[PDB]
Amino acid sequence: EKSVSVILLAGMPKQYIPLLGQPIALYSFFTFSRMPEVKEIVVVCDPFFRDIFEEYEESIDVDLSFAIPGKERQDSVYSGLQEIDVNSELVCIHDSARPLVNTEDVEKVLKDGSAVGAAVLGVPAKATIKEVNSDSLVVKTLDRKTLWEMQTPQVIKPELLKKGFELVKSEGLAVTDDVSIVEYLKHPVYVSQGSYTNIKVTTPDDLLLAERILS
Amino acid sequence: EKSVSVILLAGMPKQYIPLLGQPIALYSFFTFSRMPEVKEIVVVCDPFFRDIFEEYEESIDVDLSFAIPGKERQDSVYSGLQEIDVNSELVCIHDSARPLVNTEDVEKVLKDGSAVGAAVLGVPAKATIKEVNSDSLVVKTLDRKTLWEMQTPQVIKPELLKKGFELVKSEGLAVTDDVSIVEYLKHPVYVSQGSYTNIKVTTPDDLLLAERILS
Ligand SMILES: Oc1c(Cc2ccccc2)c(Cl)nc2ncnn12
Ligand SMILES: Oc1c(Cc2ccccc2)c(Cl)nc2ncnn12
Ligand SMILES: [K+]
Ligand SMILES: [K+]
C-alpha cells in the first residue's frame, strides 16, 4: 500500500475534452486515486489546466503534485520524476489520453513492474506488421516473432528509470519511441497483457469510440 | 492496359453493410473497374451475394468472374487465382473490407508490383510496437527497425504466387499472416507507401469512420 507514484502525462488539447461530461484526463486520474497502492499522483500539465485536477484534491485518497511539461514526451516524464516521494518503490507513467485503462490491468502491470523492475501494458498487434529496410523491401524472417502494441501504464523502479535518463544524457543517445530509454539498459522489460479497450484518444473518432466503451 | 487481374476477397457480413447506401464491397469493386490497367475482377464471395456485383456487369469496363471462398483467407486467394486470364501479367489481391483505397495508391502498388514482382500497400506503424519473446520480455534491438502496417492491394506476378502456393503445399509450411507465403520465397516484396485512410472495416466504429472519410 502507498508504494506507487503515478506520473500522469497531460501536457484545445485532446486530453481535456469531456467524455460523458468529464475531461478525458480525469478518468485515469480517478482510477489511480482509488487504488490503495497509489500514494501520490504527479500531474504533468500546463499550469492553465491545473484547476481541473486541483478541484478534487481533498476528495481523493492520494497526494497531488504538479510538474511542468517538457518539449518531448520523455522530458515530461523526467519533469514528473523530480517530484515523486523519495521512498516510492515504483513509478507508474500514464498517458492521460488513455482514459479507459482498467484497474485490474493497472494492478497487473504494477505487480509485473515490482517483480521484474520494468513493465508495460501491451496487447498483440492484430494487423500484419513488417520490418521494412531503406530500399522499401520487407525484411524477411522465417524465425517467427510475435509483435505487441504498447500502451500505458509503463511501470518502473525509480532508480532504474533515473539510470536510464543518466545513460541517454551522458552518451547522447536517440530517443525514438516510448520504450527507447530502457532499451539501452540491460535490465529486462516485461510486457503485461492488457485490454484492447485501453485506447489512446488522438482524434474525434477515438473520442467517440472511448464513449461507446464507457456505455 | 488490361494487364491486371483483380481478386476481390469478399467471403450478416461486414463487407456488405452499406456506406452512404452502397455495400462496402462495391466501393473498391468500382475503383478497380474504372482503371484501364484492370482487365477483369474475380470476386471471391458466397454465391448468395453474387447479385450485388452481377447487377453492374454490363455497366463496368472489366470482365467479371466469380470464385468460391475457402476456409482461410489464403484458400480464398487460391480459389480466385484459378479464374484469372491465362495471359494476365499481374494479380491484384484486395480485401473488400477496405472500401476507401485511392486509385492513385492502387496505381503505385501496381507499378511497384510490375517492377519488383511482388508489392503491397503499407503505412508506417504509428504505435510503439515491439517483439516479445516466450517469457513475455521485450526483445531489445538497438539496431533500429522501422515497422510498417500492411494493407491491400497485394500485387504479384501470377507465376510467383503460384510457386509460393506450390512451396507451402509441398513442404507443408505454416501460413500465419497476410504475407507469409511470399516470405518463404527468395523473391523480394516491395512496400508501396499508401494512405492512413485505407482502413479495414472490422466493426461498426470503422463502419462509422469509413463514412466520415467519404465526406
Ligand atoms: O524507456 C522509457 C520509459 C521507461 C519505461 C518504463 C517501463 C517500461 C518501459 C519503459 C518511459 Cl516511462 N518513457 C519513455 N519514453 C521513451 N523511453 N521511455
Ligand atoms: O504471400 C501472400 C500473398 C501474396 C503476396 C502478394 C504481394 C505482396 C505480399 C504477398 C497473398 Cl495475396 N496472400 C497471402 N496470405 C498469406 N500469405 N499471402
Ligand atoms: K487511433
Ligand atoms: K480497427
From Swiss-Prot, chains A, B:
The lineage of its organism: Eukaryota, Viridiplantae, Streptophyta, Embryophyta, Tracheophyta. Its main location: plastid. GO terms for cellular component: chloroplast; chloroplast stroma. GO terms for molecular function: 2-C-methyl-D-erythritol 4-phosphate cytidylyltransferase activity. The record marks R144, K200 as: Positions MEP for the nucleophilic attack. Disruption phenotype: Albino phenotype and seedling lethal when homozygous. The phenotype is caused by an early arrest in chloroplast differentiation. Disulfide bonds: none annotated. It comes from Arabidopsis thaliana (Mouse-ear cress). Its EC number is 2.7.7.60. The record marks K14 as: Transition state stabilizer. Pathway: Isoprenoid biosynthesis; isopentenyl diphosphate biosynthesis via DXP pathway; isopentenyl diphosphate from 1-deoxy-D-xylulose 5-phosphate: step 2/6. Its cofactor is Mg(2+); Ni(2+); Mn(2+). Belongs to the IspD/TarI cytidylyltransferase family. IspD subfamily. Induction: Circadian-regulated with a peak in the late period of the light phase. Enzyme of the plastid non-mevalonate pathway for isoprenoid biosynthesis that catalyzes the formation of 4-diphosphocytidyl-2-C-methyl-D-erythritol from CTP and 2-C-methyl-D-erythritol 4-phosphate (MEP). Is essential for chloroplast development and required for pigments and gibberellins biosynthesis. Divalent metal cations. Mg(2+), Ni(2+) and Mn(2+) are the most effective. Co(2+) and Ca(2+) are only minimally effective. It is found in: Plastid, Chloroplast stroma. It catalyses: 2-C-methyl-D-erythritol 4-phosphate + CTP + H(+) = 4-CDP-2-C-methyl-D-erythritol + diphosphate. Expressed in leaves, stems and flowers, but not in roots. Keywords: Acetylation, Chloroplast, Isoprene biosynthesis, Nucleotidyltransferase, Plastid, Transferase, Transit peptide. One of its GO terms (biological process) is isopentenyl diphosphate biosynthetic process, methylerythritol 4-phosphate pathway. The chain holds residues 76 to 299 of 302 of the full protein. This is 2-C-methyl-D-erythritol 4-phosphate cytidylyltransferase, chloroplastic.
